[PDB]
Amino acid sequence: AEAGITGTWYNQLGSTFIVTAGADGALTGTYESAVGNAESRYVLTGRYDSAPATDGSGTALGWTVAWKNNYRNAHSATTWSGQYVGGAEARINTQWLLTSGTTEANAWKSTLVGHDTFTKVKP
Amino acid sequence: AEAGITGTWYNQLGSTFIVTAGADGALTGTYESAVGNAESRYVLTGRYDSAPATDGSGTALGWTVAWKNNYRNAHSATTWSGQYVGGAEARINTQWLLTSGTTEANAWKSTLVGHDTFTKV
Amino acid sequence: AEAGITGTWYNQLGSTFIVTAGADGALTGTYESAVGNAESRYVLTGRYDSAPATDGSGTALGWTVAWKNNYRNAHSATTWSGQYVGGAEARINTQWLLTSGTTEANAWKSTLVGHDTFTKVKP
Amino acid sequence: AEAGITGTWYNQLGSTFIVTAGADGALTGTYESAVGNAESRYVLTGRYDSAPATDGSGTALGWTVAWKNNYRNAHSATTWSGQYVGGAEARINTQWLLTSGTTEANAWKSTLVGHDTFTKV
Numbered sequence: 001a002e003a004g005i006t007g008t009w010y011n012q013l014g015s016t017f018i019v020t021a022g023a024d025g026a027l028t029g030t031y032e033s034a035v036g037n038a039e040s041r042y043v044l045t046g047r048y049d050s051a052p053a054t055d056g057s058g059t060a061l062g063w064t065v066a067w068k069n070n071y072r073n074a075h076s077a078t079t080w081s082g083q084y085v086g087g088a089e090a091r092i093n094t095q096w097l098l099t100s101g102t103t104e105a106n107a108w109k110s111t112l113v114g115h116d117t118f119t120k121v122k123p
Numbered sequence: 124a125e126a127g128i129t130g131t132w133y134n135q136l137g138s139t140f141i142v143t144a145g146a147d148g149a150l151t152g153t154y155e156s157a158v159g160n161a162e163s164r165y166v167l168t169g170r171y172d173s174a175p176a177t178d179g180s181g182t183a184l185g186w187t188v189a190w191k192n193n194y195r196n197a198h199s200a201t202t203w204s205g206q207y208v209g210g211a212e213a214r215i216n217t218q219w220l221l222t223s224g225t226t227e228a229n230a231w232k233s234t235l236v237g238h239d240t241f242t243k244v
Numbered sequence: 245a246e247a248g249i250t251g252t253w254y255n256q257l258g259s260t261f262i263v264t265a266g267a268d269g270a271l272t273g274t275y276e277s278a279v280g281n282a283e284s285r286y287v288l289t290g291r292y293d294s295a296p297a298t299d300g301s302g303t304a305l306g307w308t309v310a311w312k313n314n315y316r317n318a319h320s321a322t323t324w325s326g327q328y329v330g331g332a333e334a335r336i337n338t339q340w341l342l343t344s345g346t347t348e349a350n351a352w353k354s355t356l357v358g359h360d361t362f363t364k365v366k367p
Numbered sequence: 368a369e370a371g372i373t374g375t376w377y378n379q380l381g382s383t384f385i386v387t388a389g390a391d392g393a394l395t396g397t398y399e400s401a402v403g404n405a406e407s408r409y410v411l412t413g414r415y416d417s418a419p420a421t422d423g424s425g426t427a428l429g430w431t432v433a434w435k436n437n438y439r440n441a442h443s444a445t446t447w448s449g450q451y452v453g454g455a456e457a458r459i460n461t462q463w464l465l466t467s468g469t470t471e472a473n474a475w476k477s478t479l480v481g482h483d484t485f486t487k488v
């Protein structure tokens with residue numbers, strides 16, 4: 001749900017995710033990673049599927065962060081695809097793809113894959 | 124580096140991707156898939172890293188589509204992560220993750236992964 | 245290490261993995277899944293990289309299970325790629341790809357991706 | 368269904384895959400990669416699901432290579448998961464995971480993912 005997704009979230013690495021879900025299915029916010037060639041905050045944009053189902057199904061969503069800001073440019077972007085499960089203890093379970101810009105010759109090693117789980121902080 | 128990302132691209136499945144890249148790293152547009160529980164257009168939003176590096180490398184980017192519009196709601200979202208290469212034949216080579224909303228029980232099989240290559244041809 | 249990998253392992257879904265690591269870098273065993281179009285045990289084969297590094301690095305390894313046995317044929321195969329971390333509490337952290345056989349038309353939806361963590365049981 | 372899997376295949380990077388499929392679902396052979404911290408041949412072992420279904424579908428299979436041999440040890444392993452399609456032009460379309468051994472600290476970036484397509488040409 002938008003209200004349920006809106007908030008500050010942290011993942012197992014200690015990275016911060018601040019987001020707002022709009023009525024139109026949009027997601028906008030900032031991301032701060034605890035690891036990598038990153039520093040300070042980066043802008044994120046994504047979408048969620050606003051009308052999930054009733055049932056105890058998660059809401060699918062995804063978002064992107066290009067790792068460039070006024071302090072660093074890592075020439076890479078990460079996308080997170082996963083689901084939001086609300087409740088007392090709401091979580092966002094995801095899998096992600098991190099692509100670095102390479103020459104055609106090294107494209108075979110441009111993408112990393114992983115999974116992150118986010119926990120919402122009160123408020 | 125960045126540049127002719129803006130345009131209409133098509134992938135090997137015949138899907139259509141119409142995007143606009145903004146000068147600060149934003150990507151906006153619509154997507155129409157040739158396959159799946161989808162029909163007509165969907166909104167997409169993403170980001171790309173400009174200021175790519177100056178050893179002829181690609182420009183990294185990614186975007187998302189939630190499969191809900193005024194015709195269908197498939198309860199899923201797809202994210203594409205990859206890089207753009209311009210030149211005579213410009214290409215956007217990606218790997219995607221498609222997550223459908225499931226119950227906890229079926230969460231082990233909620234995510235499909237694949238790769239798509241887009242051209243303006 | 246071979247001895248360290250050899251044993252019975254279980255993952256978060258409640259699936260069983262029984263394996264033997266040979267001196268040559270080989271892995272052979274049976275797998276029993278708690279979920280899916282599977283029943284009873286299936287044969288598994290894989291390899292590990294026998295001479296890791298010293299250090300507190302994991303040992304990379306991977307294995308495959310084709311989901312066909314005398315009771316069921318699901319026409320699919322799964323491969324697990326990950327690392328073995330030994331110690332008192334040894335774990336095998338992996339990511340996997342599950343491919344189903346399809347027509348060329350539905351090949352875009354043939355592969356599922358996920359991650360599993362295995363815990364070794366004593367002995 | 369199963370059948371001409373046995374043979375020498377090559378992928379878009381020019382790597383060579385020489386395999387033997389056994390009648391009960393086993394795959395054995397050697398692999399030589401054209402890229403990476405690798406040289407000469409490596410042992411591979413896998414499985415395929417025969418008895419594929421009778422709606423012209425592919426045969427699922429997968430295999431593993433640990434990148435250690437008498438020349439180099441790169442402390443990594445790769446697994447390829449995909450399906451074989453025979454016919455005039457036989458193909459093995461896969462998606463792979465390459466995991467390198469890291470310390471817990473670097474475990475978030477231990478795994479690369481990609482796709483390879485093999486032909487006997």
Ligand SMILES: O=C(O)CCCC[C@@H]1SC[C@@H]2NC(=O)N[C@@H]21
Binds near residue numbers: 074
């Ligand atoms: O190093 C880079 O290229 C940019 C930083 C990448 C940080 C990654 S993105 C996925 C994973 N989740 C996090 O919170 N951090 C790492």
Ligand SMILES: O=C(O)CCCC[C@@H]1SC[C@@H]2NC(=O)N[C@@H]21
Binds near residue numbers: 155157159
């Ligand atoms: O069925 C659904 O869940 C909605 C449609 C999904 C279409 C997918 S997304 C990845 C692949 N590339 C495309 O252009 N379409 C399919």
Ligand SMILES: O=C(O)CCCC[C@@H]1SC[C@@H]2NC(=O)N[C@@H]21
Binds near residue numbers: 277279320358
């Ligand atoms: O349904 C099938 O096609 C065969 C069973 C698949 C079970 C999968 S493999 C990855 C994940 N890990 C498990 O232990 N079980 C599921």
Ligand SMILES: O=C(O)CCCC[C@@H]1SC[C@@H]2NC(=O)N[C@@H]21
Binds near residue numbers: 108382443
């Ligand atoms: O550098 C390493 O870690 C060992 C060599 C890895 C070669 C990879 S595996 C996937 C891709 N396909 C190939 O044929 N070679 C590369």
